[PDB]
Amino acid sequence: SASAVYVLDLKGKVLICRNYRGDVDMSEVEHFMPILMEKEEEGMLSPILAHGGVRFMWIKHNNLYLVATSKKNACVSLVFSFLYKVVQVFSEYFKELEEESIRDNFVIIYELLDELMDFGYPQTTDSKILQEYITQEAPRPPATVTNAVSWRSEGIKYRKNEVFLDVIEAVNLLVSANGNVLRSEIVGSIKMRVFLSGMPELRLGLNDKVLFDNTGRGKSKSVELEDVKFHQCVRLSRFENDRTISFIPPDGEFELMSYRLNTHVKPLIWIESVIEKHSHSRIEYMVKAKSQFKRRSTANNVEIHIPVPNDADSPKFKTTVGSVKWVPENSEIVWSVKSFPGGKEYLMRAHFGLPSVEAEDKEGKPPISVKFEIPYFTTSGIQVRYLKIIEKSGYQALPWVRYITQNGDYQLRTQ
Amino acid sequence: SKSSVIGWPAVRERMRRAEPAEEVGFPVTPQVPLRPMTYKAAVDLSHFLKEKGGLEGLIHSQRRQDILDLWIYHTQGYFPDWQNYTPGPGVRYPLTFGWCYKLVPVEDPEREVLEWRFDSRLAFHHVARELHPEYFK
């Protein structure tokens, strides 16, 4: 229940503001910057600010803080969801999120803000629906918003019915300094870019453990996602009733389902680091990377980031496979490898000097993270069974899907 | 299917070698479609196995069934889930409709000896579905 949502700037200037209830004065935005500065200097800065009896909830955007001032005890989660929807709509309409587009599309930006929410209650949240009624280059509102199906616009015609799916896998491993993995969770991502004619109702079917157990086929390799979230077009009733993933696919790229469950398998890449750091004399980087993934899968664009000393200079890299580049801005050395086949063993030996004068304050030990991304690999083993594409007119669809395995929160605690 | 005919002798030899009673990851062939075996496909596979032999009368085993399912998946891309047996005790009907192969006793359900037997009526009669309507949805 934010009183007014406004877009700020890096210098405190409000790029654009739009009051929705009028219960909060527009002059409260000026005091938001001093409050944020005081909070940052004291460690008490939070996204939800508080200016007396009015709370100024702000979200750190790409270039401006989306401050949504509120007065009463409005839904904080609702305000955050509205801000996220507004950010997504702006990203869809404008490819750049900065001051260049804030002051360049004000005529359409004001109309979009007015149409999105009224009296603090959001009304329009579909990017396609908003673009079909408000454009920067007006007819009556589309019937899709009024109709029940607000995620599948009717009347869409295409020459070919091709849908491109993406089995995105995020391998996150939380390995402590002792060598044991604490947080090892893999989050699935079933995103399909449906581009067909009409409003087909997708019938999602995969090798789900629950579905296999219900059907009596709980003996093969089935993916048991701890948390499964359906898309907006996905009908929750069918999933709760018999796990039937039946919903109208959206026009374009959208996230249908996103699995999320813990992983009990060995890490895809095993990286062991050795720190032979002398006392203000030199530093040793005994970094050894072992590929725990299958040899048939290659980790393309593998970049194992090893944090080097903050004051370290004149470093020498003695590795075997993969180029090592030291970035002064990042204050770390990334063991970048173009192609990392499974089972490969890469050994590196870093050596650099240190300044004679000791550092005044400590810099910490940031965890070492790798950027391995091996496509065409299904670590979870979940295989899609079928995709029920049904249309009233009747057409032969040719859906496609690709499985991509990447490294997410794969951070290894430093020694 | 020349590839299926070639793989049938090796699969039969591997099943015979395995008694009746190391690499991690899940690699996937690029561009190879994956889908469950159809009723017509299951019937054709059962007929081919019966004609070539090595499937009817062979002692049913978990290792042999897994090897056969893996060979079928490699040769045609069919998921190794349609070659399921009905719950015991007794003769286990095919899990997927259209399958002409079923497991029947040859003498705890696990300790019972099972043998693969051809069943033409299985492809036309949903005995497994009738026995377990809940499992069929």
Partner: peptide, 18 residues
Amino acid sequence: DRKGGSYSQAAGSDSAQS
């Protein structure tokens, strides 16, 4: 070709489930 895994054809439903 495409990085991150080549696109593969998808079926319509579980043919073995009837």
